[PDB]
Structure formats: C-alpha cells, structure tokens
Design an enzyme around this catalytic site. Structure first.
Site, PDB file in Angstrom:
ATOM      1  N   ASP A 184      -6.268   7.839  -1.968  1.00  0.00           N
ATOM      2  CA  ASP A 184      -6.883   7.948  -0.653  1.00  0.00           C
ATOM      3  C   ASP A 184      -5.986   8.107   0.559  1.00  0.00           C
ATOM      4  OD1 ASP A 184      -9.982   7.611  -0.799  1.00  0.00           O
ATOM      5  OD2 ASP A 184      -9.154   6.193  -2.262  1.00  0.00           O
ATOM      6  N   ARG A 185      -6.539   8.784   1.564  1.00  0.00           N
ATOM      7  CA  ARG A 185      -5.867   9.059   2.825  1.00  0.00           C
ATOM      8  C   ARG A 185      -4.815  10.125   2.631  1.00  0.00           C
ATOM      9  NH1 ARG A 185      -9.448   6.762   6.410  1.00  0.00           N
ATOM     10  NH2 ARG A 185      -9.669   4.512   5.985  1.00  0.00           N
ATOM     11  N   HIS A 210      -1.174   4.613  -0.688  1.00  0.00           N
ATOM     12  CA  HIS A 210      -2.200   5.599  -0.346  1.00  0.00           C
ATOM     13  C   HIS A 210      -1.798   7.052  -0.449  1.00  0.00           C
ATOM     14  CE1 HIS A 210      -5.331   2.811   0.761  1.00  0.00           C
ATOM     15  NE2 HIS A 210      -4.588   2.215   1.676  1.00  0.00           N
ATOM     16  N   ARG A 262     -15.172  -5.879   8.310  1.00  0.00           N
ATOM     17  CA  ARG A 262     -14.950  -4.714   7.461  1.00  0.00           C
ATOM     18  C   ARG A 262     -16.306  -4.378   6.872  1.00  0.00           C
ATOM     19  NH1 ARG A 262     -10.394  -3.015   6.643  1.00  0.00           N
ATOM     20  NH2 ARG A 262      -8.332  -3.997   6.392  1.00  0.00           N
ATOM     21  N   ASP A 265      -4.305   0.040  -3.760  1.00  0.00           N
ATOM     22  CA  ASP A 265      -4.371   1.158  -2.809  1.00  0.00           C
ATOM     23  C   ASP A 265      -3.346   2.221  -3.133  1.00  0.00           C
ATOM     24  OD1 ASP A 265      -6.264  -0.400  -1.565  1.00  0.00           O
ATOM     25  OD2 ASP A 265      -5.494  -0.043   0.490  1.00  0.00           O
ATOM     26  N   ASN A 310      -8.572  -2.434  -3.006  1.00  0.00           N
ATOM     27  CA  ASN A 310      -9.910  -2.118  -2.508  1.00  0.00           C
ATOM     28  C   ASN A 310     -10.270  -0.660  -2.744  1.00  0.00           C
ATOM     29  OD1 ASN A 310      -7.769  -1.885  -0.501  1.00  0.00           O
ATOM     30  ND2 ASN A 310      -9.344  -1.148   0.973  1.00  0.00           N
ATOM     31  N   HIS A 311      -9.277   0.155  -3.098  1.00  0.00           N
ATOM     32  CA  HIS A 311      -9.501   1.575  -3.318  1.00  0.00           C
ATOM     33  C   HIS A 311      -9.616   2.035  -4.772  1.00  0.00           C
ATOM     34  CE1 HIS A 311      -9.437   3.636   0.647  1.00  0.00           C
ATOM     35  NE2 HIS A 311      -8.817   2.542   1.050  1.00  0.00           N
ATOM     36  N   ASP A 365       0.815  -1.195   0.000  1.00  0.00           N
ATOM     37  CA  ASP A 365       0.000   0.000   0.000  1.00  0.00           C
ATOM     38  C   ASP A 365       0.861   1.263   0.000  1.00  0.00           C
ATOM     39  OD1 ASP A 365      -2.164  -1.777   0.117  1.00  0.00           O
ATOM     40  OD2 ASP A 365      -3.322  -0.445   1.462  1.00  0.00           O
ATOM     41  N   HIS A 415      -3.021  -5.708   2.698  1.00  0.00           N
ATOM     42  CA  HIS A 415      -4.176  -4.843   2.637  1.00  0.00           C
ATOM     43  C   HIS A 415      -4.454  -4.314   4.024  1.00  0.00           C
ATOM     44  CE1 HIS A 415      -8.294  -3.554   2.157  1.00  0.00           C
ATOM     45  NE2 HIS A 415      -8.837  -4.682   2.581  1.00  0.00           N
ATOM     46  N   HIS A 428      -4.128  -7.719  -3.598  1.00  0.00           N
ATOM     47  CA  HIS A 428      -4.270  -6.715  -2.549  1.00  0.00           C
ATOM     48  C   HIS A 428      -4.815  -7.380  -1.302  1.00  0.00           C
ATOM     49  CE1 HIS A 428      -4.988  -2.973  -0.424  1.00  0.00           C
ATOM     50  NE2 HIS A 428      -6.280  -3.222  -0.312  1.00  0.00           N
TER      51      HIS A 428
HETATM   52 MN   LIG Z   1      -5.195   0.119   2.420  1.00  0.00          MN
HETATM   53 MN   LIG Z   2      -6.764  -1.788   1.242  1.00  0.00          MN
END
Ligand SMILES: [Mn+2]
Ligand SMILES: [Mn+2]
Lengths: 293, 7, 388, 582
Positions: A87-88, A58, A213, A84, A116-117, A56, A240, A166
C-alpha cells in the site's frame, strides 16, 4: 534433494533485489512455502537478540533498499519487521515478494509481522490490489498474497524482555498468554483483540480512548505501564503511526514508535529510522532519509 | 493527512 | 472635482504599471492595496451609474497585472503520484491581484456598462491570454478566472466561437499530449452552463464537442478530479438531446477501466446518473451490453465495485426499466447474482446479493423461476460431463 | 507434426476475446508465413485492411507488426501493400498507436522504389496531411523527411508546399508537430530551399501565439544553423535566436539555455564570442531558477569550447563575474547545478588564477548546507591537485575535506571515503600515517553499514598503495582489535576486512596474523558471526597452502557443519564443496 531449491531462492532474491517482480506461477510457489514455514510460528513470536527492528515500509522499495544500506544486509544481519508492507508506495509487489522470499530462505534471520494492511480489504481500498493487476493482468497474485498474510504472526518477544506489534495494546488483552490463545489464521476482523493489536495507538488522553481511526483503541501512560509490569516487559515496540522524526518515545520511555517508510507515500516529508537491539538489548536508533531516486 | 486510515 | 474622467484614467494608471515583486518581502509601501479597494467601492456602492467614459485603461491595467507566463510546476512528475494529493501552492501578491480580479469583475458585471465599451478592447488575444491562466493558485486564482471567463462568454456573442474552440485546444493537449493541467475541473463547470442552454436543435459542432472531446476525457487516469464536473456535462448534454444517449453509453462502456478500481467505481456511478435520465426508447439500445457489464461488476472481487454495482437495485426508475424489459435482462444478470456465492471473504455481498435476487422475484415471478430453472439445468450438465 | 495450430490463429483473429485476438495478431507474421506471400498479399492484408479494431493494445500490436512485412508481403516490389492499414492506424485517436503506425510507415518507406513512392507513399502523406482531423495531420508531419530526397523535382515542389501548411495550422497541436519536425525536414531540402523556404517557416513558428510552439522552434534553429554557411547566419537565423534568449515565456528562454552549447558549436566560434557570450550571461542572471541553473550546467562545456585565442580572457572577464554570484544563489538547484561543473575551469585558468579565484568558491560549496552542492563538489577534487600545487591542496582544502570526512549525511561521508586512495597516494604515506589514518579507521565503525563496507574495501585500495608491510604495522592491528567489540555488527566487520586484506597480503601475513582470528571466531555466540566465518574461509581459502588447508581448516570447518543454526550449517558445507575438502 536439499540443493534443488535453496539454490533457486538465492536467485529469486537476486532478481527481486534488482527490483523485478517474480512471475505469477512463481509467486504462488513462494507463498506456498512461506505458508508451511509461517504456520509453525506462534502468535507472539519469541525471537532472540541481537536484531534490528523495522517498522513500516509501505511498498517504498527503493527506500527499503536504503534501509538495508543502513542496518546491513541479510542474512548477515538479523531483522524484525512490524507489518505494513504494501500500500501507498509505487512498488508494493516487489517489496513484499522480496521480504517473503527472505523469510522462506534465511528462515531464522528475519522476522515479519502482520500489519493493519495485511488485510484484503485495506489492500483493495488503498492500492496493493490494483497494483497486482496493473502488473500481472489477473488478480491472482493478490489472492495468493492476501492469503499468505493470514499466517503472519501478530507479535514478537525479544529475549522475553521486549514486546513487538504493528499497532498496540488491547483492552481484551491483558497478558501474553491472552494472545497465544487467539486465532490469527483469519482476515483481520473489524473489532476484537486481534484487530486492536494491529490498529491500537498511544494516547496522552490517559486510559482507553476510542480511536478516531475506526478500529482499535487509544491506550495511555497508565495502560502501557501496567502492561509492561504485568507480563514482565521492559519496553513495548510498536510502530503504526507516521512520526515526523523516524521514531518516537512516549508514555515515559515505556512504549516506542518507529516509522521506517521515509517521506511516506512519497508525500509526508518525514524521516524514517530503525532500531538496533544488540547482544545485550541496547537502544541504538538510526534515522535515514529517502534514498536518492 | 491523505485519508484517517494513515499524512 | 466633477471631472473624474481623468481622475480615474490617471488613477488606474497608478494601479496599472505599478507591479511590485512580492518575492523578497521589501518596500512595504501599500498605496495600491488601497488605490484599488477604492476603484471598487466606487463603481459598486451605487457611487455610480454613469462611468462609461470611452476607456480601456482598466483592461490594459488588468492585462498587465494578470498576464504573465505562469511559473514552473511545484508538484512532482506524475507517475507514482496522485494529483488529488498535491499541496496547493499559494501565490503571493494575491492580496494584490485578489483585487485586480475583484475590480475587473465588479466591472463589466455592472449594468449600463455596454458590450462595446469593450468589444475591441477585449479581443480574442485577451481571451486566450486569459485562458492560459487557468493554471494554479488553489482555486482562488482559478475561481476568479472561472467566473470571469463565464461572464466574458455570455456577453460577447463574438468570442463565443473562440472561447469554445480555444477551450477544446486545451483539452486535446491535455488528453493526448501532456496528461497534466489544473483548470480542467474549473473549465468543465463553465462548460456546464454553456451546454445547458444550447441551440434547441443542436448545431452539429457540439455533438463533436461531446463525442470527440468530452467522452475521451474519461480516458485520463487523473479523472478522479474533474470526474464529477465532467459527468454533469455528459448528463446535461443528454437532457438537451437524448439521441446522443446510445453513443455516449457505448463510449463509457469501451473506455471502461480495467486496472483502477476507483475509476471503475466512478464510471458505474456516472452510469447510474445517466440511466436515471435515460429515455425508455433508448434504454433498449444499450441495456444488453450495459447490463452485460454490470453483471461482471457484481462478480468482481473488489467489494468497492460489486457494492456500487448492486446499488442499482435500490433505484425506482432503473428497476422500472429493468422490468418492462425483464425478459432479456434477468438471464444476463442471473449467472452472477445466482453465482454460487459460497466462495467469498467479504461476508457482506453474499447477503447484498440475496437481496437483489429477492428484489428480482417481485417483478416477474415466472421469469425468475424459469431462469433459475434454465441455469440449474445447464449448471447440471457442466458438472456431469466436465468430470471425466 | 501438423498445421492445425497456425490455422486456428487465422481464426482467433476475430475470436472476440480481445486477449486472444491480441496474441493471434501479436504473432501475425507466422500467419503470413504459413500463409505464404501471394496469399498474404491477397487475403491477410485485405482483412487487416477492412477490419476496424477498437482495443488499443491490439491496435498498437498490429501497427508494429506491419512494419516488418516487407519480406513476407513478397519483397520491395510489393511493400507498397502494407500501406492502407498503417495509413489507417496512422489516423487512430489514441496517440501511441498512430505514433507506432508512423514509426513503421517510415521504416517500410525505405523499401519503396522512387517509382512506388511518387505513386503510392507520397499520396498517403498527401492525404494524411490533407486530413479532416488534427491527428492525421499531426502524423503527416513525421512523414516528409523520408520521401522528399527520392521523389521528383516537381513532387518535392508539392511536398514543400504541403509541409508549409501543417506549419500554418489553426491547431496548436499540429503547429507544435510541424515545428518539432521542421528541423529534420530542413536537413533534406537542397541548401537554397532551406534559406528561401525553411527560414520563413522557422521565423513564424518561432513567434507563434503559443509559447509551447515557440520553444519547439528554438530546437530547430540549431539544425538550421548547421546547414547554413556562416555568412548567412547573422542575416537569417541570428535575429530570431537572439529573440528567443529574450522571449517572455521562460519556457522558451529555458530552451536557449539547455540547447546552448549545441547552438554555440553550430552558430560559430566567432558569433559565439559576439552574441552568445553576452546572451549567456543574461541567462545566468535570469529571473527563473530553472533558466538560471539550466545555464549553470552549461558553463564548463561553454568555456572549454570557447575559441582558443580569448578563452582564458573571456572566462576571466565575462563568465567568472556572474559565476561568483551564482555560487551564492538561494535556489539550491542552481547552487548544486554549477557546483558540479565549476571545477572543470581549473585546467583552463591555470595553477594561478585557480588558486586566486576558483579555489575560494570550492570552499564556498564544500561547506554549503545543501548536501547536493557539497556532494556535487566533493566529487572532482580527484583533479584540482593536477592544477593547484598538491601542497596547495593539502594546505587550503584538506582541512575541509577532513571535515566532510565525517559529517551527518552519509552519502557525503562516503564521497570522501571514495576519494581517499588518491589523497593518501598523492599526499604520501608518512603523511597519511600521521594525520589521515584515524579517519580511515573511524569509518570502519560507522553506524550506517554503507559507510563501513565502503571503508572496508577502501583498505584493500590502500594496501595496494603502501605495500603489505605497512598494513602489518598500521592496519592488521586495529582491524583485529574489533573482534572484541560486543556489537556483533562490528565484531563481524573484522572477518570482512580479512576477506579483503588476504587478497593482497601474500600467503604469509594471511596465515600468521589473519587465519587465527578467523578460527577464534567460529566460536562466538551470534550465529551471524559464525556462518560468516564459514563464508570467510571459503574466501581466504585458495590463498592458503594445501598443507595449512587440511590442517587447521577442514578440522574446524567441520565443527560448524555440525552446528545448531541452519545458516551456519549450510555455509560450512558449501565451504568445503568449493574448497574441495569432501
Ligand atoms: Mn502504516
Ligand atoms: Mn499501519
């Protein structure tokens, strides 16, 4: 005819590499290319070692750079990322734009997977979306990019021996052929194999468990073990979940997690690390700290 | 710990 | 003995200048931890009803156990960080102070203890120094302060001007100067109570309060924190006088976000909380522009918004209003609710919309069709010419 | 061929699609251009003047535009036109806009002739300051420094009065502004007035109920102390300045700390030795980590600037005591803070003291956990040996340096790698070859690439120091031994070094000991290794003789242009086109 572009990308990268977003008109152009290049790939991408597995990121651009000062730089060194990207973080755009630029260029020196992103919905929810506006005024670079994301392959097989994804394992998925039949050319669904692959995690509760989740499941030692033995896997490399230590082994050296985003969301004070598979698939991990900003 | 969807 | 008016004025002095630095973990001699728990159960557990001897040995004590310059911030700069995600740095010596507040609270809170046993022992200078405090120990520190300042306000009609004026001064510095502070949330609750019980025919300095302090708060990007306590104030204010409606709604409409989805949601939400109390005669002053905006929302691409926008349709009152004035509204919404909803990914709003329209038919059929007509018609022309 | 576009911008200024309205304003000059002054004066301003804009982004744009219409409004004779709108933008709520509004108001102030100033400009400031809303007044503050000098004796009278009012405002916000500008304003008043007028305001604003006011007074004390003749300092300024170094609100103390050497110099060389010196300890021994470290940063500069005739003494009896203490603080930032400047004391206390006093500390830090403090110290050894004996160094420091040379946190490993070339030279090559070499070779095989690259370059810096002959018998050997290592990462490393060694090994050594291995690798499994060989030859190309170039090069740099991996391909081709081999 060939020097009318490959010479320009080299620049696009030089630019992003200095941390300056490409221009709208340019993003689309980049994504279009990345498309054609990504269509052609499988859902279980088979890429030969030696390589470096990266988890990751991000949008933590600067800490991405730091990574590169560690594992070397492209194309000089082979890479493989596991989703990923956005994001963030505070510099999502730049980061993804870049990684993509790299794929469109040194086409076979880097391998990026969907996480997942790379889904519209989360990107809206968790940040990316807004950042696009905040930086481009409209919300087109968002569309442009949310669509490229759909052509990102779901998994990777290094020398037929190591599996990469991921998230993790899925009930609806027993074999690797059970994955090549799927259709990733679509937005990450809420339930199903595809979704699972990008949301599933490793558990110590043994046997499939419902994920706290909201998607995917919580496979266990047993589940892992069979999978490997089944398809002929020596190790399943996912990543992940934030592992305070940069990377973690579980299910008896069967499956491993690798978070590459250090000090995650600029809050989680964790270490991040990457894994370097050499000329003869050897486990060598490199942990690193957030780049002094 | 920021919110499940993952600190 | 039977002469404690020197047993306490000597006891408090013990607890007062005591001050024991709890940032080294040494000299574990309680003494005070108890010396206070006593001065508490003493004026609390009915062990008293006549301990009004002329003495501020409490205030002094407090104002030397409390009043200090808060330490340097423990949370990062603020650009790439969101305040909601800051780890609450806890202040030690709490177990100590925790009482000085408890006591000083279980002090002038009790009956028979006049407002002149303090009138000049609790002067602005005490208010002010007290205020600054609204700054850090996870609620705790604040919470007390919140309460304390509430009661000191509704007891001394003399500091009312001040506490208020001074609460503003914080806000203006928060809004225009540094865009950082913690007690904005707490403070706003306090201002909740205060508004809710103003002079029935509103003194004009308040309308300024609202218009020039309150609304502008919706400007800051860390709004995600005091937003709710804020709205309440905005709302409460509209109940104490629905004149201000038109300008408060025209405010939010201007300050309306444009690159911060979450705020967009919040506004939308604060907006309904207002419509809900809107006054018919006033809903007509806005409406047009209000709904001109709602329209856009519906046609946003950020499901989080479009979803919160359409949720209006599930509100009796709002719908009610929309009907009595369906004439001018239906046309403004239409183009977006009837927007050729065939180019989305969120396989959910398309249905969510059908449902709104459907809820629009049942209200005034004719109008509905008549607009559908008008649109389709126009819609046609543009598809004809604009293809040369 | 036409004036149509422009003519439309003069229409898209009220369009209503803010986004357009913006641009049409963002270009507002080329409208007053194609409009032509006499018009610009009588139509375009009165429109910008009587038009209430909402959108801030636009409001900021206009404010910035106006500051340049000096020319386009028709020259200095008229500049006083651009007043009314700015004067409004200066009132606007959102700060940034009015901030820019003022920025301009100043810039275009310099255009008004005193005649005008006294007549239009001054008034504006008067009105702004006399404002109802604090913002206006807040703005006003920044407008004095620009007209006081040029107005009249009687006008300055009034102006002074006004400014003293914005300093005695009921609004902290204004006071803070008044404070912040007090400095730049005293700098224009006639000396006398600074004493009889400024000073009093200075004192007040320096003891306000509000600390965030007080501390902005501390910054002005520095400007005033420079205008004031020494004598008076002890009687007007000094009381206060001392007061600040004591203030309860650490935020204030923090200031005297940060703005210390700035005071030092302003105060004087003596009053420094008199009050600042003690006061200076005070801060190093402060209760607030910040104020502490805040003073730490100012240790080197403080001393360097200490009067010539006491320096080495006061450092030795006053400063040095507290320092020893700091070194062992618990707040890493204070340990890391001074850990950077400290070494600059070496050249002050001489070869002796330095070894008997400071050198110990250098060890304290050089070993301290906190990378920062090591890293902040490791970075000045480039010096020390200039004071302590170069032997003393290799004796009581090199042992540790040879430790850091390979500690976890790579940024420190690096810090050493970068300090080698000096050590190597200063220490002498035979020493290097005996006790240092290996380290410098180890780095060539570090896990973190950053560390290898650094160490790779670090060689070329050495060959520059020990002659190409040395490199042939101490380096080129091992460097090539890598060509074996299984890991393609290290394997490449070789090709890298070459690309660097060649720049400095003369056509010879380059052709007989490097160019072979560069070719022997163009046949390796990992394409990464191959395409790099291509980029390698493109580097060590020119250094070769035209003969060896079309001999072994081109032929083998063709077997690549025809390789599977596209990367290899691209690089071979673009390895000829440059070499001019096709
Ligand atoms: Mn992540
Ligand atoms: Mn993730």
């Amino acid at each position: 005819d060939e020097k009318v572009f490959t010479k320009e990308l080299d620049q696009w990268i030089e630019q992003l590499n200095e941390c300056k977003q490409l221009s709208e008109s340019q993003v689309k152009s980049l994504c279009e290319k990345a498309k054609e290049i990504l269509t052609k790939e499988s859902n279980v991408q088979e890429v030969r070692c030696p390589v470096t597995v990266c988890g990751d990121v991000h949008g933590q651009f600067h800490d991405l750079m730091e990574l590169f000062r560690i594992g070397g730089k492209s194309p000089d060194t082979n890479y493989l990322f596991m989703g990923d990207y956005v994001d963030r973080g505070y510099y999502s755009v730049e980061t993804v734009t870049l990684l993509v630029a790299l794929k469109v260029r040194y086409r076979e020196r880097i391998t990026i997977l969907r996480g997942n992103h790379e889904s519209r919905q989360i990107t809206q929810v968790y940040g990316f979306y807004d950042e696009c506006l905040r930086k481009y005024g409209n919300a087109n670079v968002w569309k442009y990019f949310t669509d490229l994301f759909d052509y990102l392959p779901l998994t990777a097989l290094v020398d037929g021996q190591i599996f990469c994804l991921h998230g993790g394992l899925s009930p609806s998925i027993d074999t690797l052929d059970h994955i090549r039949a799927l259709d990733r050319l679509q937005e990450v669904p809420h339930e199903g194999p595809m979704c699972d692959l990008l949301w599933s995690d490793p558990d110590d509760r043994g046997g499939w468990g419902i994920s706290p989740r909201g998607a995917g499941y919580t496979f266990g030692q047993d589940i892992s073990e069979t999978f490997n033995h089944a398809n002929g896997l020596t190790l399943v490399s996912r990543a992940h979940q934030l592992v305070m230590e940069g990377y973690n082994w579980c299910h008896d050296r069967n499956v491993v997690t690798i978070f590459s985003a250090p000090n995650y969301c600029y809050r989680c004070g964790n270490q991040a690390a990457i894994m370097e598979l050499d000329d003869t698939l050897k486990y060598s991990f490199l942990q690193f700290d957030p780049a002094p900003r | 710990x920021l919110x499940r969807x993952x600190x | 003995q039977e002469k404690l008016f020197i047993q306490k004025l000597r006891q408090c002095c013990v607890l007062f200048d005591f001050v024991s630095d709890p940032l080294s973990d040494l000299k574990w001699k309680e003494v005070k931890r108890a010396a206070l728990s006593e001065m508490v159960e003493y004026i609390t557990h009915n062990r008293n009803v006549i301990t009004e001897p002329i003495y501020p040995e409490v205030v002094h004590m407090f104002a030397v156990n409390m009043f200090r310059t808060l330490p340097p911030s423990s949370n990062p700069t603020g650009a790439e960080f969101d305040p909601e995600e800051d780890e609450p740095t806890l202040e030690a010596a709490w177990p100590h102070l925790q009482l000085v507040y408890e006591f000083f609270l279980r002090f002038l809170e009790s009956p028979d203890f006049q407002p002149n046993i303090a009138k000049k022992y609790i002067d602005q200078k005490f208010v002010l120094q007290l205020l600054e405090l609204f700054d850090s120990e996870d609620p705790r520190e604040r919470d007390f302060l919140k309460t304390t300042l509430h009661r000191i306000y509704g007891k001394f009609l003399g500091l009312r001007a001040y506490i208020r004026k001074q609460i503003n001064n914080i806000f203006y510095r928060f809004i225009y100067e540094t865009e950082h502070h913690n007690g904005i949330a707490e403070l706003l609750e306090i201002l909740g109570s205060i508004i809710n019980g103003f002079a029935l025919p509103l003194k004009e300095e308040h309308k300024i309060f609202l218009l020039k302090v309150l609304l502008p708060l919706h400007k800051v990007k860390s709004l995600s924190v005091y937003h709710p306590q804020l709205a309440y104030c905005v709302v409460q204010f509209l109940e104490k006088d629905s004149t201000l409606t038109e300008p408060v709604v025209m405010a939010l409409l201007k300050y309306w976000p444009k690159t911060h989805s979450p705020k967009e949601v919040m506004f939308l939400n604060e907006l309904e909380e207002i419509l809900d109390v809107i006054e018919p005669s006033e809903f007509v002053k806005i409406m047009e522009p209000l709904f001109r905006q709602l329209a856009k929302c519906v046609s946003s691409p950020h499901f989080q918004v479009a979803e919160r926008a359409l949720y209006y349709w599930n509100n009796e009152y709002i719908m009610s209003l929309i009907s009595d004035n369906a004439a001018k509204i239906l046309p403004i919404m239409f183009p977006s609710l009837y927007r050729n909803s065939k180019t989305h990914w969120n396989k959910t709003i398309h249905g969510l919309i059908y449902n709104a329209l459907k809820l629009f038919m049942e209200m005034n059929q004719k109008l509905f069709d008549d607009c559908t007509q008008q649109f389709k018609a126009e819609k046609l022309k543009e598809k004809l010419k604009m293809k040369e | 061929d036409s004036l149509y576009p422009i003519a439309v911008l003069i229409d898209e200024l009220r369009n209503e699609d803010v986004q357009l309205r913006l641009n049409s304003i963002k270009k507002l000059s080329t409208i007053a251009l194609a409009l032509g002054v006499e018009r610009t004066r009588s139509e375009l301003l009165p429109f910008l003047t009587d038009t209430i804009y909402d959108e801030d982004e636009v409001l900021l744009a206009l404010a910035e535009q106006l500051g340049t219409f000096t020319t386009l409004v028709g020259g200095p004779e008229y500049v006083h036109c651009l007043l009314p709108p700015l004067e409004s933008l200066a009132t606007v709520e959102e700060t940034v806009v009015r901030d820019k509004a003022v920025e301009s108001l100043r810039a275009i102030s310099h255009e008004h002739s005193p005649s005008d100033l006294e007549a239009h400009f001054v008034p504006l400031v008067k009105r702004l300051a006399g404002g109802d809303w604090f913002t206006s007044r807040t703005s006003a503050c920044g407008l004095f420094s620009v007209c006081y000098p040029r107005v009249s004796s009687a006008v300055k009278a009034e102006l002074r009065q006004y400014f003293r009012n914005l300093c005695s405002d009921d609004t902290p916000m204004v006071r803070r502004a008044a404070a912040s500008k007090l400095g730049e304003f005293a700098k224009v008043l006639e000396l006398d007035n600074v004493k009889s007028e400024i000073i009093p305001m200075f004192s007040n604003l320096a003891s306000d109920e509000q600390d965030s006011v007080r501390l902005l007074a501390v910054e002005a004390c520095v400007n005033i102390a420079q205008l004031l003749p020494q004598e008076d300092l002890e009687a007007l300024v000094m009381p206060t300045l001392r007061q600040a170094a004591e203030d309860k609100s650490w935020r204030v103390r923090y200031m005297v700390a940060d703005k210390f050497t700035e005071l030092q110099k302003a105060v004087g060389p003596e009053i420094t030795k008199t009050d600042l010196v003690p006061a200076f300890q005070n801060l190093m021994k402060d209760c607030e980590a910040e104020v502490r470290a805040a003073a730490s940063h100012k240790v080197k500069e403080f001393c360097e600037n200490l009067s010539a005739d006491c320096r080495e003494n006061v450092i030795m009896s006053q400063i040095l005591p507290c320092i020893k203490e700091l070194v062992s603080d618990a707040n890493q930032h204070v340990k890391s803070a001074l850990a950077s400047v400290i070494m600059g004391l070496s050249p002050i206390l001489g070869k002796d003291n330095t070894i008997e006093h400071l050198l110990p500390l250098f060890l304290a830090q050089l070993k301290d956990e906190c990378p920062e403090v090591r890293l902040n110290i490791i970075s000045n050894l480039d010096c020390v040996n200039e004071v302590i004996g170069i032997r003393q160094l290799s004796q009581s420091l090199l042992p540790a340096i040879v430790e850091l040379a390979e500690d976890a946190k790579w940024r420190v490993r690096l810090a050493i790698i970068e300090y080698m070339p000096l050590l190597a030279g200063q220490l002498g090559v035979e020493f290097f070859d005996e006790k240092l070499n290996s380290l410098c070779m180890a780095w060539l095989v570090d896990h973190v690439y950053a560390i290898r690259e650094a160490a790779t370059s670090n060689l070329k810096k050495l060959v520059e120091k020990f002659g190409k002959e040395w490199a042939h018998a101490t380096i080129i050997p091992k460097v090539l031994a890598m060509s074996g290592d299984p890991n393609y990462l290290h394997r490449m490393t070789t090709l890298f070094c070459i690309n660097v060694l060649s720049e400095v090994c003369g056509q010879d050594i380059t052709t007989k000991h490097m160019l072979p291995t560069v070719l022997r690798m163009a046949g390796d499994p990992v394409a990464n290794v191959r395409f790099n060989v291509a980029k390698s030859l493109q580097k060590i190309g020119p250094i070769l003789d035209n003969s060896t170039l079309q001999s072994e090069v081109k032929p083998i740099l063709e077997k690549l242009t025809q390789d599977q991996d596209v990367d290899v391909k691209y690089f071979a081709q673009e390895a000829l086109t440059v070499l001019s081999l096709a």
